């Protein structure tokens, strides 16, 4: 049921999604171990992910959350990196896409920093890196991230350096409490609370 529509680089929508990718790169405390060493990306393609059934599943849950939270879905656009991006865009998010060992429990994790999601493209901790060269910092191989619409609802705030949401909450927010430059990360515990809106194909770029 999924079709992928290419955006033109001239399209304002391409440009605004690219800007969110590039502008939310940061340095990571692993010195690039998981995701590679880079300050920016080479964006190769941005595609809109269109699936009516998955969209309706998302908006149905969004309305339920909204109604439980004074008509406020608390919807964000957030990055998700996973070796399972291809399954996600066809079948939707579900329990198989959860990070069982995540610091906020077994849920599906999203980041404000694109560079954080980039650390997960080849698996937890970058796995063994790219399939072709076994390099977590590969500058040749094409990578993919999702830029997703995510319903947070009432989000449980965790200050810090598939399970259930905390009672009375629809998500968890992981607030950075140490690294002053890090943006927030978020966890949802139901696949229906995220829609994979854009598929971004890119390379990390070797700094000069
Ligand atoms: O453990 C896994 O088995 C199935 C799939 N998976 C997985 C784990 C973590 C991530 C991931 N974890 C994050 C943690 C924090 C912030 C972003 C992310 C992010 O974009 N992705 C994605 C998928
Ligand atoms: Zn490679």
Swiss-Prot record:
Zn(2+) binds at residues 130, 133, 138, 141. It is found in: Cytoplasm; Golgi apparatus membrane; Nucleus; Chromosome, Telomere. Residues 8-208 form the PARP catalytic domain. Highly expressed in placenta, skeletal muscle, liver, brain, kidney, heart, thymus, spinal cord, lung, peripheral blood leukocytes, pancreas, lymph nodes, spleen, prostate, testis, ovary, small intestine, colon, mammary gland, breast and breast carcinoma, and in common-type meningioma. Highly expressed in fetal liver, heart and brain. It comes from the Eukaryota. Ubiquitinated at 'Lys-48' and 'Lys-63' by RNF146 when auto-poly-ADP-ribosylated; this leads to degradation. Deubiquitinated by USP25; leading to stabilization. Oligomerizes and associates with TNKS. Interacts with the cytoplasmic domain of LNPEP/Otase in SLC2A4/GLUT4-vesicles. Binds to the N-terminus of Grb14 and TRF1 with its ankyrin repeat region. Interacts with HIF1AN. Interacts with RNF146; this interaction leads to ubiquitination and proteasomal degradation. Interacts with NUMA1. Belongs to the ARTD/PARP family. Poly-ADP-ribosyltransferase involved in various processes such as Wnt signaling pathway, telomere length and vesicle trafficking. Acts as an activator of the Wnt signaling pathway by mediating poly-ADP-ribosylation of AXIN1 and AXIN2, 2 key components of the beta-catenin destruction complex: poly-ADP-ribosylated target proteins are recognized by RNF146, which mediates their ubiquitination and subsequent degradation. Also mediates poly-ADP-ribosylation of BLZF1 and CASC3, followed by recruitment of RNF146 and subsequent ubiquitination. This is Poly [ADP-ribose] polymerase tankyrase-2. It comes from Homo sapiens (Human). The lineage of its organism: Eukaryota, Metazoa, Chordata, Craniata, Vertebrata. The gene is TNKS2.
